[PDB]
Amino acid sequence: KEIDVSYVKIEEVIGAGEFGEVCRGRLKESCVAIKTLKGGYTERQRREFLSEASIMGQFEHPNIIRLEGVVTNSMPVMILTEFMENGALDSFLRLNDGQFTVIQLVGMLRGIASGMRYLAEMSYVHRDLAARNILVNSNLVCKVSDFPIRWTAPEAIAFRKFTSASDVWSYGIVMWEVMSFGERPYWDMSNQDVINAIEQDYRLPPPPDCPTSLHQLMLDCWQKDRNARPRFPQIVSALDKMIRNPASLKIVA
After folding, report:
1. Looking at the structure, do residues 8 and 77 belong to the same domain, yes or no?
2. Is 19 annotated as a binding residue?
3. Is 77 within 8 Å of 70 (Cβ atoms)?
């Protein structure tokens, strides 16, 4: 949908993307995030930058970042998406350390898993699933955005075999990041140390106070055999069961 630039105001730079800046902005009133395309570029590069908006435009889900539209009849060329007040999930959790209950964290993981289940159903492989690419709004709603050795499945690092099963591996790492309040997967281990650890069949331990059943689900996500991993609908079902039976989440190691 073409948005007239007179309805758009640009504010503070909130991040960086492959084609330029990500900015906070206003649409008239609501807050939006704006991806700008400035400087030199060919038509093919402009179409490449704008392909993200048509991809997002195909998606309609409570846990997938919403598109507002594009600005193409003026410079800068822009993609407007809904603004997510709390930003990236990893930094939001690190700042708000211990501020959310086990049940609230499960709700966040359930949202993410539902968003991923939607993408997988649409035959869409994300390839870059990490807490840094999960955006949080004012109501703590977690949304998959952006349409990394530590988050990548072994077969995807080794053979570039990116599948929804390799996103499940990434999801398991997302789980660990959430339950640890935005701790870095594998701490300050180098990428080669991480690869070496996975080859030893080492797996990330339960974060402090993490329910055993949630850590078990992480291990399920981290099976070396991609075919042994649960699929996104199975992950959603496991979390829904934990939500129906919160007393089961009191079992910790």
Report:
1. yes
2. yes
3. yes
Please tell me which residue in 4, 90, 97, 128 is annotated as part of the active site. Answer: 128
| 1 plus 91 within the same structural domain | no
H/E run at residue 12? strand 8-16
Q: For residue 33, say whether it is annotated as part of any ligand binding site.
A: no
Q: Domain of 157: which CATH number?
A: 1.10.510.10
Q: What was the elucidation method?
A: X-ray
DSSP-based three-state secondary structure for 187: coil
Q: How far is the C-alpha of 88 from the C-alpha of 96, rounded, in Å?
A: 12
Q: Is 159 annotated as a binding residue?
A: no
Strands 87-88 vs 77-82: parallel, antiparallel or unpaired: unpaired
Q: Which domain holds residue 28?
A: 1-83
Query: CA–CA separation, 44 vs 160, rounded Å?
Result: 25
Helices (H), 64-211: 89-95, 102-121, 154-159, 164-179, 191-199
Q: Cβ atoms within 10 A of the Cβ of 75, count?
A: 11
Q: What domain count does the chain have?
A: 2
Residue 35 assigned to a binding site: yes
97 flagged as catalytic: no
Answer with the one of 55, 83, 111 that is the final residue of a domain. Answer: 83
For this entry, resolution in Å reads 2.1
Task: Kindly state the tokens that stand for 49.
Answer: 């930058």
**97 and 53 together in one domain:** no
Do strands 87-88 and 134-136 pair parallel, antiparallel, or not at all (unpaired)? Answer: antiparallel
